[PDB]
Specification:
homotrimer, mainly beta, Lipocalin, four-stranded antiparallel beta sheet, globular, binds beta-D-fructopyranose, binds sodium ion, sugar binding protein, calixarene, protein framework
């Protein structure tokens, strides 16, 4: 089936749910006023996520895997880019 | 194999582990005095979870997927019910 | 594909990413100064993780599944050992 990963922050809360579906990962977002589609859209058959909230900043790391290759995607307030994570 | 998702809260801690096994998701609970089977029992081949603790209340969201359909299940102090989450 | 699970703590942060790959789970670690391979290495086709930081101590629980058997692995400051978790 499709595979999901979820994270949340604050007291509203904000929630992000990532779904790997047919080789593509997309993102659904809740910030207290309805679900919507987020900016994250990257290839992958499997996804995990962690996040940490510091002051006014959310930091999100999404680990997207295809075959044996895992790419880390980073949100630090200014869009998604690949992070330095490698498998070894 | 079976697929799991885990969350925890507080300092005891309380832990919840969800297992998707043969199309069914069940829940195991730890609150500091042994593991036991929780109330959550719903269909699904894949599961993710997030939770947030506010004051005296734990809020849990479990994302259960079968095929391309994902159902959000909500714990907000009074049993599990379906939440408003949709895939798009 | 390979399957991952991730957790993080503090403000640096520390991040741990577990990868189930070809029946083996390994661990990659970030503590603010580069990624490295952690001590965790155990069998499994699926992995989930949760952690909680209390005072100066991180507690990590990794749920490793092969077939219908799930083993809980515990980090409480002194290496990884099997925990009391059972499926029922
Ligand atoms: O619009 C909300 C948003 O900016 O929140 C932070 C990230 O989850 C982004 O992908 C997302 O688009
Ligand atoms: O600021 C981005 C970054 O340094 O954040 C910490 C880790 O996620 C790294 O892999 C990543 O490159
Ligand atoms: O008995 C403990 C319990 O009420 O804790 C909150 C939820 O995890 C429930 O499914 C569970 O049954
Ligand atoms: O109180 C339930 C609810 O509003 O909580 C926030 C989100 O999980 C929603 O999808 C859900 O319907
Ligand atoms: O070296 C860092 C380390 O000790 O951090 C705690 C655990 O994640 C361990 O597996 C890991 O080796
Ligand atoms: O100290 C280890 C332990 O008691 O921690 C809480 C739970 O993870 C238990 O299954 C585990 O045996
Ligand atoms: Na992944
Ligand atoms: Na799911
Ligand atoms: Na598992």
């Amino acid at each position: 089936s499709v595979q999901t990963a979820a994270t949340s922050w604050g007291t509203v809360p904000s929630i992000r749910v990532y779904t790997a579906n047919n080789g593509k990962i997309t993102e659904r977002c809740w910030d207290g006023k309805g679900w919507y589609t987020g900016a994250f859209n990257e290839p992958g058959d499997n996804v995990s996520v962690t996040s940490w909230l510091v002051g006014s900043a959310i930091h999100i790391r999404v680990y997207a895997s295809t075959g044996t290759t895992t790419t880390e995607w980073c949100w630090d307030g200014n869009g998604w880019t690949k992070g330095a994570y490698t498998a070894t």
